[PDB]
Every structure is written in C-alpha cells, then in structure tokens.
Amino acid sequence: VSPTRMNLLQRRGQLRLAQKGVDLLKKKRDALVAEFFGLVREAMEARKALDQAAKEAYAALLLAQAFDGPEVVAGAALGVPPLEGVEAEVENVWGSKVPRLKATFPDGALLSPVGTPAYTLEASRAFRRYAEALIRVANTETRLKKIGEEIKKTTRRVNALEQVVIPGIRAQIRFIQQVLEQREREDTFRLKRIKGKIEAREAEEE
C-alpha cells in the first residue's frame, strides 16, 4: 500500500474504528446472552409443563382402551380426520425470522366428534392440550437455537477482528512509519552533505 502520511492517518483511523467495532460487537453479544439466559428459563418452564401435560394425557388414555374394546377405540380414532389448524407464521427475533406456530386451532373442524366408547371422546381434549404443549416447546426451542447461532456468529466476528484485523492494521502502521522515518533520515543526510559543501566552499575558496 502507498506509504504516505495521509495513508498512515487513514490506517490509524481504520484501527480506531475497528477497536470501536469490537466494543460494539461485545455489547451486542452481552445483550444477546442476557436474552438467552432468560429464554432458557422460559424453555425449561415450558418443558416441565409439557412433561406434566404428557403424563396426564397418557394416564387419561391408558384406561380408555381397557374398559372399552381397543378395536372400537381405533375405529373411533379413524373417524376423526387429520385436520390442520397450525399457522406457521414468521416472527422477527434479533433481526431474524423464525417459524412461529400460532395455531388457529379450530375445535369445530373435527368430523364425527362423537365416539361410541364412553371415555374415548374425553381423551381427545387431553391430547389436544398435549399437542399445544408440544407446539409451545418447539416454538421456544427453535428461538433458543437461533439465539445460540447468533451468539456464535457474533463471537466469530469478535475473534476474527481482534485476532486478524487489528494486528494486521498494526503491522501496516508500523511499516508505513518505518518508511517515513527512513525518508526523513535520508533527507537529513542530504542536508548535512550540502551544508558541509557550502561550509567547505567558504572555508577553502571563500
């Protein structure tokens, strides 16, 4: 790169901007981690709630197939169609979009809701709640993954800067400064030569 004083000043300005950018990235990462360590709390609360919901739903379903014939329960289940009620919208999180399952959940869309077995119909509500819990746990988990990747990316940027960019600009600055000092030394040597020339002229031939 061209060794000149203006180039040196521009390189130093770049170095200052790089240090400022490292501070800015660190602060962004601090915000990200502050959010991540609370979103983990939310995720664990959701996970324990889902565990409880699944336990209760399984307990409710267990006795349904005992008192009543399993074949009749299977037929009643086949009567219910596999309808769709999940709306996979996009939620903006830290500048990123993630799939949010804001399910409309139409309860009246279940064809042939009535089940011949006495207890099978009641068990449907338990599995609906279990599915809601599963959707919730998935929703929190995806965003947790996203924030993790964001923190990893930010730390990649910070390390790249502080380990590749700043030292490189330091080396460039040192090189340019050395070249300028050399030019100054050559100029001083020349000035000494010419001053000695004039002094010798005066001393010898006046």
């Binding site: 000149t4 004083r5 203006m6 901007l17 800015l24 500048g95």
Partner: protein, 192 residues
C-alpha cells in the same frame, strides 16, 4: 504529490484560506462530480452570510442548510456501523438516514457541467431541492413511526421527481417545485 494533503503547500494554504474545497479520488473514480469530499471540506464565511441568504434567497435557508449538514453528519456516523456489519443489520430509522444521505449525494450534491441546464444552479433552485428533500425526510420518518415498511418508501414515485429536479430548466423550476411539494404531501397522505 500523490494526493497527500500533508505537503507543505497544502498545509500552508489551509492556514490562510476561508474555504477549503477538498477533492476526492474515490468519488472521481466513480465519475461522481464535482467530486468534493464533504467530510474534509469546510467554509468560514457561512455565519457572516446569513443575512444575505435571508434577504435574497429564503428566510429559512440557513436552517435548511443546517438540517442537511445534520443529516450528512448522521450518515457519516452510521457509515462506521455500515462497514462493520452492513446495511441490512441497521434498524429502519438508521436505514432511512442512509437512504436520505444517498438521495442528497445523488440528487443535490451531484451536478453535471456538460449539461445545458444542470451546469448552472441558482440559489433558489438549490433551496427548492433542499426543501423537497427535507419534507420527504419528515414524511418518511413519520411513516416509519406509524409502521410503514422502509422498503415500501423507496418505491414511492416522488423519488424520481426529486432525483430529476436537477435537470429542470431554471424558468420552469417554480412550477415543478410547487407540484413536487404537492406530490410529496400526497404520496403519504393517501396511505394515511
């Protein structure tokens, strides 16, 4: 020599002149003329010329000029982050600052000397263009505050009029400018 501004001649001139029109290699390379480096240029006659501007151009010309200076300085501040992380990483208001900065660069500071119209610009024409830009910025900022998507502001047709105002003839300019102000009010009034 070399474009270096630390030469004794340039430094000696800096300490005596009242205005410094610093030219830039980056802009001239892009064929962006006059190619003046805004950050490294200055004037010292601005304060003393306010009365004349109020009398002979517009009673609020000083404030419009200062508003453009404010916007350009905001752009210059945000460009650090732009280089760090890129334009998409910024918020919408900062993106608007960047975009209005580009509008000022291309539609107000840019000027063509080989054109039969834009080679010369009167003070009132500059004032009209500046007023158009400031009005647009206020409208767009309000829209962002009311939630309009920034990508949708950049497609407003009024931007082509703001950008082509340079090439309007001096005699025709006042009508074009009145129409442009009307259209700027409309382009956001309709959205409501």
């Amino acid at each position: 020599p070399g474009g270096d501004m630390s030469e004794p001649v340039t430094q000696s001139t800096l300490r005596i002149v009242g205005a410094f029109w610093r030219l830039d290699a980056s802009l001239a390379f892009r064929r962006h003329f006059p190619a003046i480096n805004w950050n490294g240029s200055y004037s010292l006659f601005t304060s003393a010329l306010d009365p004349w501007y109020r009398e002979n151009v517009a009673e609020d010309y000083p404030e419009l000029r200062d508003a453009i200076s404010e916007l350009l300085q905001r752009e210059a501040g945000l460009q650090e982050i732009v280089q760090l992380v890129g334009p998409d990483a910024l918020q919408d208001a900062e993106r608007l600052v960047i975009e209005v900065g580009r509008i000022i660069r291309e539609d107000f500071l840019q000027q063509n000397a080989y054109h039969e119209v834009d080679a010369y610009c009167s003070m009132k024409k500059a004032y009209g263009i500046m007023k158009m830009i400031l009005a647009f910025y206020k409208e767009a900022e309000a829209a962002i505050k009311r939630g309009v998507s920034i990508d949708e502001i950049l497609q407003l047709p009024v931007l082509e009029r703001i950008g082509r105002a340079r090439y309007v003839s001096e005699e025709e300019f006042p009508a074009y400018f009145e129409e442009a102000m009307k259209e700027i009010q409309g382009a956001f009034k309709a959205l409501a």
